[PDB]
Structure formats: C-alpha cells, structure tokens
Design a protein around this ligand. Sequence first.
Ligand SMILES: Nc1nc2c(ncn2[C@@H]2O[C@H](COP(=O)(O)OP(=O)(O)OP(=O)(O)O)[C@@H](O)[C@H]2O)c(=O)[nH]1
Ligand SMILES: Nc1nc2c(ncn2[C@@H]2O[C@H](COP(=O)(O)OP(=O)(O)O)[C@@H](O)[C@H]2O)c(=O)[nH]1
Ligand SMILES: Nc1ncnc2c1ncn2[C@@H]1O[C@H](COP(=O)(O)OP(=O)(O)O)[C@@H](O)[C@H]1O
Ligand SMILES: Nc1ncnc2c1ncn2[C@@H]1O[C@H](COP(=O)(O)OP(=O)(O)O)[C@@H](O)[C@H]1O
Ligand code: ALF
Ligand SMILES: [Mg+2]
Ligand SMILES: [Mg+2]
Lengths: 428, 428, 355, 334
Amino acid sequence: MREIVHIQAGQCGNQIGAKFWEVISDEHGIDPTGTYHGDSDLQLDRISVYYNEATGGKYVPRAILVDLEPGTMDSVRSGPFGQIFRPDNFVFGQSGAGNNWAKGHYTEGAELVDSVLDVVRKEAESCDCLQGFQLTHSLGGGTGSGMGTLLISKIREEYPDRIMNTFSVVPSPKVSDTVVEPYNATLSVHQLVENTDETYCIDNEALYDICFRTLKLTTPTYGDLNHLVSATMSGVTTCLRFPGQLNADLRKLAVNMVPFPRLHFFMPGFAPLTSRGSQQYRALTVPELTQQVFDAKNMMAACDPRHGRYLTVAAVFRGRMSMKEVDEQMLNVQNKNSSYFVEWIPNNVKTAVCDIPPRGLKMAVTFIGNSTAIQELFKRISEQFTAMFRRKAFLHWYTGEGMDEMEFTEAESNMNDLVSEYQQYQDA
Amino acid sequence: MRECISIHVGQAGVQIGNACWELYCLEHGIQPDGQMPDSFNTFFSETGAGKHVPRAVFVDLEPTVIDEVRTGTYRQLFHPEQLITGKEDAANNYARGHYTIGKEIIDLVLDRIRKLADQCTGLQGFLVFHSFGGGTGSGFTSLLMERLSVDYGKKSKLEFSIYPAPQVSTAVVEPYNSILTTHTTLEHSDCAFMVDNEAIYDICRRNLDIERPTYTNLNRLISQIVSSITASLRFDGALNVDLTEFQTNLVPYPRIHFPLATYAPVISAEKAYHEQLSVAEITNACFEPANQMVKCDPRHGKYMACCLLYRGDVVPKDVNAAIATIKTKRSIQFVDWCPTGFKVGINYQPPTVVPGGDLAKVQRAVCMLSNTTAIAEAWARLDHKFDLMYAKRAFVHWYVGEGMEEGEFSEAREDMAALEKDYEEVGV
Amino acid sequence: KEQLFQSNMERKELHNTVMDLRGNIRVFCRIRPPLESEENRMCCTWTYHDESTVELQSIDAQAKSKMGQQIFSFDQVFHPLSSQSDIFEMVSPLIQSALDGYNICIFAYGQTGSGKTYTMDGVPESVGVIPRTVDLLFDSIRGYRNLGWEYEIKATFLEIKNEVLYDLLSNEQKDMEIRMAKNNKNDIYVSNITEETVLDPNHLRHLMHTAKMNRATAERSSRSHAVTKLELIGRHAEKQEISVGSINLVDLAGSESPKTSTRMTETKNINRSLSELTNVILALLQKQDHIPYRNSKLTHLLMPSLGGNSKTLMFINVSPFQDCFQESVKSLRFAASVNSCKMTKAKRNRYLNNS
Amino acid sequence: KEQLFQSNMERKELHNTVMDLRGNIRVFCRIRPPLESEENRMCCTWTYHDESTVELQSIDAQAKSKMGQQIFSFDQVFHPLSSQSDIFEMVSPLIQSALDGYNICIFAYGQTGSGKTYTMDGVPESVGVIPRTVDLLFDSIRGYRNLGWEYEIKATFLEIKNEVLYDLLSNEQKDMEIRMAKNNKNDIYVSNITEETVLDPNHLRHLMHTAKMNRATASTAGNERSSRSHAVTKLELIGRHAEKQEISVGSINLVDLAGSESPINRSLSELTNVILALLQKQDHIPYRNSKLTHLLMPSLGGNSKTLMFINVSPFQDCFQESVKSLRFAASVNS
Ligand SMILES: Nc1nc2c(ncn2[C@@H]2O[C@H](COP(=O)(O)OP(=O)(O)OP(=O)(O)O)[C@@H](O)[C@H]2O)c(=O)[nH]1
Ligand SMILES: Nc1nc2c(ncn2[C@@H]2O[C@H](COP(=O)(O)OP(=O)(O)O)[C@@H](O)[C@H]2O)c(=O)[nH]1
Ligand SMILES: Nc1ncnc2c1ncn2[C@@H]1O[C@H](COP(=O)(O)OP(=O)(O)O)[C@@H](O)[C@H]1O
Ligand SMILES: Nc1ncnc2c1ncn2[C@@H]1O[C@H](COP(=O)(O)OP(=O)(O)O)[C@@H](O)[C@H]1O
Ligand code: ALF
Ligand SMILES: [Mg+2]
Ligand SMILES: [Mg+2]
C-alpha cells in the first residue's frame, strides 16, 4: 500500500527522526510501547504506510537508524519512544566518521552502509508497495552527510523509480559549526543533485530567530528545532497517509515541483506559528494563517524570497478550509509578489486539502516552494569552498583518506551550475 | 429497458457520482443498502432479491477515493467489485495513466463495464465522471473512453469532464493533462458535457448564496444537473430526449461536442421564496449570462444548439412561449447554421433534492445544455497555457518518461487549435 | 572535356569543404530503401527538390486536411538508391579533421528499422561507416608516418541503458562514473572504463566483433544508447608536438513514441535523452546564458561533443512511410531546428613538449 | 564549350564562398635570400617551425635569453628558396574572385629593404605579382569571351605620401579628392584621376612603366620619397553579359605599402587598426581617419578579400623591426 521507509543519519538526523516518530505516534494515537490506544479508527486507515504491524497491536515503526558513534542510539534507547523500535533496526558502527565526509564514505561509513542496506531492503520487500526514501539527516556533520550519500547511491541504483524525499539541514550562513562543512556539504550535494530529486534548506539560525521572534521563545533548544522540522515533515505526507477532499501524495508533488530534473531543491514551511499564549491578540482563522504563511518571516532558511521568485508552490492546507479563499489569496499574492514570482510559469499552486488536521490544532498548512532564492545560498557556499580551497585549508584530513581534489573541483563546478540555473530561470 | 451505465474515476468524479446517485436513489426511493420501500431499471440493477445496485463502476489509480465510497453510506449501492482500487494515482500526468498505470487498469474496468453491458438489456451510453487537469481524469479516462469506442463506440458515451479551473490551476500542469486527454478524447467523444468548478463557485455566490460550500456542494449541483439530464430516461415526460438524441441535439459536428451544463433552480431556499419559480423566470435563469457551468461568455458565443431538460409541473406550451422570447433576445446568440436550436427535453417529473441538499427543492426545473462557441475561448486559453509551458519544455520530461512524446504534444496543440477554428467556422 | 571534368571535380571538393567548413552542424537526412512489405502495407510520398532538400508530401487523409508541403532544406539528402560510400564520402573530410586534432561526434537519429546500424555498423551486407572510417584513418596514419607523425589509438566502448552505465567490453558489473579530466575542465572522461591500446586493424575488427555480440546479447539494441570514443594522440619527435583528437561514434535509440509495444523504464530513459537534448538545443538557439548540461547523463557525457571544442554530425534516418509519417516529420522539424543550431568553436590540440 | 564554362562559373563562385568561409585577411611571411653585397652581414637564427610558423632568434647570446619566445604563426611561410610562382599561387584564387564581382586587396608589409617591392613589382628576370596577375586576368577574360561575358579593364595609378594623393599617369598636377560613388554609397571614386582602359598586357606594362618613371622613386636615393610612400595600383573589372545583364563589378587593389621602420606612419597605423578591427568584427571601422583607408573602404568589407604579406630581412640589424612586423602579423593569427 505505497508504503514509505525511513532512514536516519547523523545525530541531527536521529534526533529529528525521534521527535518525528513521536509526532506521528501522537497523530495515530500510538502508545510509547507500540500498542494502539487512539480512538480514531481512521488512524489505522493507512497506519501501514509508517507502522508495520508486528503482533497483537504492537506496530513496528519502519525506521532505520544509522550512525557510527553509539551514543546517539544509546540515548534513543534511554529516550522514550526509543524502545518502541524493533531493536534489529539499530544498525550502527563504533568508531565514528569524525565530521569527515571521506571517512563517512570510504572508512567506517562504507562498512556500515554496506551492513544496513541488507536490513533496509529486507524491510522493503517486507512491505507491499513503496514510494520512496526519507534520508532524514543533516549536512552539518561528515557522517550523516557521507554515509547518506553512499547510501543514496545504493538506494538510487537499487530503487531508481522510488522518489527520495530526503530532508537535510543546510549549513548555517553565519554558524559554520563544521570548519570543513564547505567541502562536506559540497561533496554531498554533488552526488545528491546527481541522484536525488528533492532537498530542503533548513538553517539553524533561521529557526532560532523564528522561535525567538515569531514564537516568542527564549531558549531555542534543539528540541524546538527538531519539533518544527518534524511537524513540517509530517504535513508533507499527511495528504498521502490521510484522506481528504483533494488528496495528493509524494508522487503528485514530486512531478509538480520540478520543471527540470536538476532544478529539484525546495523550501518547506508550516502554519500557524502562534506563540505560547498569543491566542487573544489575534483570532485563529485560515485567512490570517495564509497571510502569515507566505511571508519571508515564515520561511525556513536564511534564503530571503526578497531575492528570488517562487517558481512553484505546493501548499497543502492540512485540515478543513475553503478552496475559494485560498484561490483568491494565491491570486492576491501573485498580484502583489509578481516580481517575486516566475512570470514565465503562471498558475502555479498545488492546493491539496487534507481533511484531518493536526492534534489540538483546527487549521494548518505546510508551504513548499521551489523559490529561485537558493542560488545565493549556493553562492556563499561556493565562496566558502573556494576560499578554503585556495590554501587547501585543512585538506590533509580528506586527502589522507585516499581522496583527490578532482572531485572537489567537479562538485564546485556543479554547484556553480546550480547557481547558474537558478539565476537564469529567475531572470528569464 | 433503455438501461445505461456510468463510470467514475479520479478524486473528481467518484464523489460527483456519489452525489449524483444520492439524487438518483432519492427519486427512486432506494435505500443506501439498495432496497426500494420501474425508474431504476435503467440505472439501479434490481437483482432477484430486493437489491437495486446502480450501474456505476468507480475505478481510480488512487484507492483512497474507492475507500471513501466504501466508508460512504452507498457502500452497498456501489458494488465492491465495481469499486476498482489501485496503488499510486497517476500524478498530474496523463502519460502515467495512459501508458504506464491506467494502460493495464482500463482492461479490468473493461471487464466490469462489459459484464454490466451483458446484464444491461439495451446499453444507451457511458456517463464517465472526471476532470481535465486531473492525471487520472486525463490519461486514465481518455484511454478508458477511447477503449469504450473501440469496444463499442455505438453507445452514446456521454463524456462529463470537469473543465480545469482557469483562474486557479489546482495542477500547475493542468494544461498538458487537459490538451492530452482531449487529444485522445475529442476523436471518440460522442458528446462531452462541460462543467468548470469556478463557475459553480460563482453560482454558489450569485444563486446558492453559500458563504462556505465544500466540494460536496458542487457535487450536489452536478447531482441535480445529471438528475434532470437523465430524467427523460428514468421518468416519462412530454418530450424524452435520451443520450442518443443528446448527441444529435447538442453536438452538430464530429469535433464540436462540448456543451456547457446549466441548472435554472440553483438559487438558495431564501432566493426560492424571493422568486415565484415561474417557468418563464427559470427559463431566463437557465439562459442568464452567468449560469453557464464553464468560464465563458455565452453572449459573445454562438450557440450551436441548446437542450433544456425541463422537468416538474411544466408544459411544452409555456416552454415554447418562454423560449420564443429568449430566441428574440439579442443577448442570446446562436450559430448562423443552426439559429433555431431551442429543442427542450420537457418532462413532467418534479426534481427532488437530497435531505439537507444545498439546492432549493423546486416544483419544476430545467437543465439547459448550450453547445456554444463561447467555450472556444476557454479551449484557446487551455491550449495557450500548454503552448507556453511546452515552448520551453516544462514538465515534459515526466510525460515523455511515462510514454508521452513531444510529437504527440504538438499533435495535441494543433488538434486544440483546429478545434477553435472549427468552433468559429460553425459560428460563421 | 578534360577541363570540364577537372572543373566539376574541383567544385565537388568545394562542396565537401563548405558543408563542414561552414556547418557547423551537418544535419544529414538519409532516406533508406523502403522495405517491400512495409511499402505494400502503407507508404507515403517524397520529392527531392534538390540534392539537399526533401519534401515528404504524404498529404493523404489527415495530412491532407491538417498539413501542407513537408519541404525541409538540409545539408544533404540521400536517395533510397544512395550507397554506403555515398554517405561516407562526406564523413571522410571530417575524419581528416578529427585526425588533425579535433573532436568529432556522430549521432544516428531514427526509429526502429530506420537503418541506424546500417549507417554505423554498416550491416552484415557490404560495410558501414565504422569499418570505412577505420580503414580511412589507418591509411591517413601510415601517410603521416611518411610525414613523421606517430599516432596511437585508444578505444573505449560504453553503453547507456535505463540510466545505468554498462561496459560493452567487460561482462562484469562495474560502477561507471563520467567525470571531467584533471588536466582540463572541458574534456570529460569515464572512470573504470575498459581501455585498450589498438595494435592493428585486425585486432580492432576482432574487438568490434566481440563488442557487437555483447551488444546483441545485451529488442534492447533498438532502444539502447551506444557510445564509442576513439582517442588519437599524434607524436612528432622532430617537431616535439602532440596532436590530440577524439572520435565519438554515438548510436542513438528509437525516437518512437511509447504507443503500446513499449516498456516503461526504457521509454522513460529515451524520453530523458530526447527531451533534455531538445531543451538544451532550444536554449542554445535561444542564446540562453546557462545551458543545463547536468540534467541527464547523455548531454553530460557529450558536453565537449555538444558544448566543447568539437564538430558533430546529425544523421536523420527516416522511414518514408505514412504510418510513421508523423514521427518522421517531427524528426525533420527537430533536424531543421538543430540545423539552425550552433556548435562551440572547435580547437586543434597542439602541445609542444619542449619542457 | 558552353557547359565547360558554366561549370567553371559555378566552380569559381563556390570558390569565393570557401574564401569568405575562410575569412580572407590571410597573413603570409616571406624571407629574402641574402645578396652578393650582404654576405658580410650578420644574420638571425631562423629555425623553421613547419611552413605555417617561423621564429627568429638573435645571434647575441646576451640578448637571445632576454627576449623569451619569438614564435609567430602564419597561414603560409615563404623561405628564401621560395620562387615568385609560390607567392602567386595564392593570388590567383583572389584574382578569380575579383573576376566574380569581389574586391581584392594585395598588401606587402615590412621595413625598407625587406622585399615588398619585388614581392609586388618584381624583376624582369622573375616577374612580380603585377605581371602574373595581368597575364592570368587576360587569359581569364579570353576564356570568359566564349560564354558572352565582356570584360573591360580600367587601371588607375596613384601614390600616397603625406595623406596627399598624386597621379602617376600624368605630370599635370591637380587636386584629387576621395568621394562617395554616385550609384553606390559604399563604393568610392577619386576625382581627376586618369582612368585608362587596358587593351592588352603590353598596354598595362607601358602604363606601369610610365607610372614608375613619373613616380620619381627615391627609396635608396636619399630615403625620402619612395621609401615613405604608398604605391596603390587599382585594376577594375567590369564584365557585361549580352542578353543576360547581371554585370559583375570587381576591383583589384594591389598596394605597395611604405616602410614600417621607425623614423609616413599616419596611413600605415590606420591601416593596421582597420585590419585589426575587421578581424575583431568591430561595428565601426575608422575608414575616414586616413586617405589610404578611405580609398580602400569599399575593398575592405565583409565580402571583400584582403591579402597580407609580411616581408622581413634575415639580418641581425633588422631584427628590431622584423620582430615588430612579426608581432603585427601575430595580431592576426590570435
Ligand atoms: N466538483 C468537484 N471537483 C473536485 C472534487 N475533487 C476534486 N475536484 C477538482 O478536481 C481537480 C483536481 O484534480 P483531481 O480531481 O484531484 O485529480 P484526479 O482526477 O484524482 O487525478 P490525479 O491528478 O491523478 O489524482 C480540481 O479542479 C478540483 O476542484 C470534488 O469532490 N468535486
Ligand atoms: N535541526 C537540528 N540540527 C541539528 C541537531 N543536532 C545537530 N544538528 C546540526 O547537524 C550537525 C550534525 O550533523 P551530523 O551528520 O548529524 O553529524 P556527525 O554524525 O557527527 O557527522 C550539527 O553540526 C548541527 O549543525 C538537532 O537536534 N537539530
Ligand atoms: N540500405 C539498406 N539496404 C537493405 N536493407 C536495409 C537498408 N537500410 C536498412 N535496412 C534494413 O532495415 C533493418 C533495420 O536494421 P537495424 O539498423 O539493425 O535496426 P534500426 O534500423 O532500428 O537501427 C535491417 O534489417 C536492414 O535489413
Ligand atoms: N627574393 C629576392 N631575391 C633576390 N633579391 C632580392 C629579393 N628580395 C629583395 N631583394 C633585393 O633587395 C633589394 C631591396 O629592394 P626591396 O627590399 O624589394 O625594396 P623595398 O625596400 O621597397 O621593399 C633589391 O635591390 C633586391 O635586389
Ligand atoms: F532496430 Al535498432 F537500433 F533501432 F537495432
Ligand atoms: Mg540497432
Ligand atoms: Mg619600395
């Protein structure tokens, strides 16, 4: 039944996946044990697309957890909703890629990706029909970024038809936590754009400011960031896993957001972003929700739409709202943001109302735009790459692991190519 | 027994048929289980036991819609075998449902419709309910409809494709789906009744006066439309015009077969009290410049012929007087070749409404069907949208990677362009 | 009469030059002899207004009421009576340019049964472009040994199918990647390719023969992409120069629409190739600032052959039949569009080894 | 007969097509062999990098290592062993194109003593470009007679010294001006010039002899007049076919450029700039900035063919100007 299989990579990927499956369990009323205690039988309608039932109401989450340092998975065991996984799935290494992409792709990462592929494919034929792969990871560290690319190559060659809805945290423009992230992210996205068809741009400082100012938060703990991305990630597929007046799936958006093969990176989002107790200073409704969903303040990366144009948009509107009011709203935003809008492609919108709203929230939407605003992000990444490449800045760690600057030059060229495509289609 | 069958496919069409059968059972007094505490012989197949199963096979590449009617009260009415499911839908890609998925699915529905035809005493035609921009509504239906012509073709297939909303394209690739399906429908389309969702929204604002109407409300309007359309077959009337006569009455040219539907009593219950529901007033209402079910200018469009499905306490004498005044109306414009196409399917069966139905129950009704050249402009804009997208080959990779060809795209373009020329040539 | 013969022969030589000299993309429309069975089944009408212009009339029932004169002017139009030599004499000057130190790429565009293998492979009957160009290249090589140039030949055989790269020379399943060289950013090579040094034409015949059985073993032949890269290096010890040239023999797949007798994934790959090629060539005609060369493996592999220092050919193998008339005329439209296209200036490779 | 020359007409037409496809503006280098009076002259180290390139080295090892590379490529390189027929072999296609309605420019460039004059004029023992061109032109006209084409040659001789035009066919000094042609705004004519009609090669030989005598050459007699003047001889082809019309108007502009050695350079620098701009496809070409460029403006268009010769003296004392001439030539090949 067009099931989906979940992959986790790097400590970020593992943590965001943990909170993600907690969110899904909340959606479907799944106890931390694994036994179903929800009330809506409709939660069991497509429960199979995530929770493969094992025995007696105990549903195994379809999760593959991959890492080269056991600490994250040990926390998962200790953490709630960790024991809910079937322990066979926790296929991990011991040494650690050490924030080295080459290590994550030819050292321990190579052996573990080799060791997990069997488990993931076994889970695959364990399911009836498959749609794709979510490589829930981040480009921040060499591990999740490397092994993930090694895995995506294996995943693509064995399952090319499958659409990989991989989610990645783009290196922060200001917070360069990984000194070699310019080399890392670039090496990753080379192979990605060679194979993948949909990525996302998530900036740690973007969510920092979002929770600080839109949410009125004071302690932007990573828990909040994990919850935000997990909530958006769920809304991506609620159309598939849940009924609705106008139902979409991964395939719909997959064939709708990409005018071209390569031009396949996207900016997500969600609504509303109400604070802790702002319930009074506004009245919750879908007009205001739409109004505050399309603004740059409710973006996801530091990519300001004030420098790009929404090539395509895939607003979902999880819940029950009005097709009209969304039509006139997209009309109005097209009129007012026509400059920040591809004139070459008109009539771009993907309203995909899904009946069931999130828990405790009457109204919701997940924005997904292919805005031509990433080219500045790739520009700054390429600038960091070439700046650290003129002096081969800490290149010895990579080159020593049997690697050559050949691929670095090629990846930089392809990133320039993505910048060229974005600017060329934004202008034309 | 002039028995006819209906088929349903895509998110739009299965719910459309569900609401249509709701009114059919309402005027046949049949329960959702299929017992009537005659007129259903043509539609509801009364079996040896007290089970009247309506001749309706609901087949979609997405099983969610089949599941929704399975959970629908008409689960018994909609034979489970007639409810054909699937895995992935057809994306927004005609090619996917025309050469990869629906290509093999049509054969299963072929068995369903042909066995229904065997049970049927004298098949009249096929009521295919679907959309133009819909992926399954395009490729799957176009292949299904053309295969029906291959299987029979003699049957007056009454195509019912929902016109794609021009102001808001639910699918950014709606133009491709619409032009491609017509490329594989126009040639085999005996008579394609046309209805646009945006026009229903405008009707629900000017007549139904509903601030928040769901798609079910749109389907209710269509339910009354098709109820009056097939009222002649189900119920005796002064002049019973069947699907066979519908073709001769509506379509005068092998390619010119796209009449827009129109229902006079679409006013709200309060508006029903406001009006006197006069035969003359409702004749004007069904000939008002804003009652066309497609976004077109009827005043500027030459009408090939208008088919009024008059029903309720109405006599052809009063209809003749009212239509005579409408014929004199300069605003009402008919093609020079056929300027006297005022044929009216007058019936003496009052139109019923589903309990809680948005449309006000009126003692009389008229389903005006006007095949006008006004829709040529609508076809032109659809072709134009496809042309600008195909000009830079946008989203073509998906179609060609699903069995489509750039040559077929050009064929579809010239087919639609030639259709516009045929429309204006009929007008002059 | 002797002066007349000299004049007309000199003019014929000028014909061969201009074609390649101006070009720069020589779109050739060769009409193969119509098959008798397919003729008596259904056939269309063609008139050659000149040796380089063809009008595929048809205009029977649908083409009658929907289309007019299918006159299309090209670089050269070949009659069904044209021989293998007739199409080969125009390849010989381009082979001379290739051995001069220029990159050359060859495409055979057509549907199933068009005769693409009869052009390249040459078909068991008689010989084709490949053996003729091998013999010509070896003859020019010995001639330039008489001129003091020593040339080495490198042959790489690669097959593209369902997006997965396959090595035609080795049966082992190997992971292929195509990458630009480290020395220059323009030239692009494929990693882990079975590379062999050609010793004599006999060994080249043997390896081509084995590769052709491997091709037939791998109706996939009509729907799979074959890429042949012949790299020539010319050393002149007295001059201390190295001349570098490449020959790209590419066998395209059937351009037919899916219709019914087709499989999904193979059709999808063919659509990748054709649609991405159409988009990039249209962008080139559009003078677009950026051309997306990295959407499909096909255009990325032949990035030097399409956007680099090379001279490339179009062979439009067209079946002159009404059933395929629509696909054929679509092919002629695309062939005229690419005839209007422009190639990036080719560059002769001279490398002095003084250092 | 008729078919032979019809095929010849088609052949020569497509020959000019190939020429335009090549881009014309072909640069060539010629080296003069040393004379009996220059056996005691220091030469240069001429190592011949094929027949399309040549580089020169100074004998002085103190200076040889201080100039780096001196390699310059050409379309064809002439050695001292090359005979005048070798030079003329590439002039005949241009003359044939001129017979077809195209404008042809023949230029000899270099320092004084390089050999430009004997590249164009030549000696009675070994004739130059002028006699071979006129002989081939008259043979071509005799051939054209058979298809009805009637060719008339109009020869004009003029000299440019200090941006002032002087007529070499008459001693009656007048004032001559460069003016736009009456029936063609792109074509040019000069007023008051003696435009004699050539009847046979003897007539043009007599005209050339008279022009040379009236020129009062002083290239070696003081290095004042001939060494710093441009010898422009124009041959115009006007062919008219009976019962076909379609006249072909073409001109041959063989120019003997003045000395390029350091001290008028006013015309030479403008010609160099015009040639470089034509090679760069510049929108605006400064034709009117000098008399020589303005005179040859109709003969320097896209369809017009321009021919260049770079004569260099293989002597050590001429090295400093030979390298400048070769650099000017290399501004064309790159
Ligand atoms: N009136 C009405 N229109 C509907 C309904 N559901 C969808 N639509 C219209 O259908 C169009 C969207 O395409 P879908 O119907 O979702 O497509 P589909 O036919 O299911 O095919 P796929 O694209 O393959 O899923 C829009 O014009 C919607 O307004 C419905 O219940 N009633
Ligand atoms: N949103 C989010 N980002 C995180 C989180 N933890 C880490 N990150 C980011 O992702 C990076 C970790 O990358 P990863 O591949 O997991 O690291 P590795 O396994 O050590 O190579 C960090 O440097 C952060 O930038 C988290 O909980 N949430
Ligand atoms: N000039 C020709 N003479 C004889 N047969 C030909 C000629 N050209 C094509 N054919 C026939 O067309 C058929 C197509 O063969 P092939 O080239 O292998 O497939 P495709 O044309 O699809 O590439 C062959 O069987 C061959 O006999
Ligand atoms: N190819 C040649 N063969 C023999 N002598 C030559 C050659 N070229 C030039 N000379 C000699 O060079 C001398 C200088 O004349 P030249 O250089 O032609 O005049 P200019 O300086 O005007 O070009 C002449 O006396 C001639 O004898
Ligand atoms: F039939 Al084929 F290449 F098209 F062998
Ligand atoms: Mg073949
Ligand atoms: Mg002189």
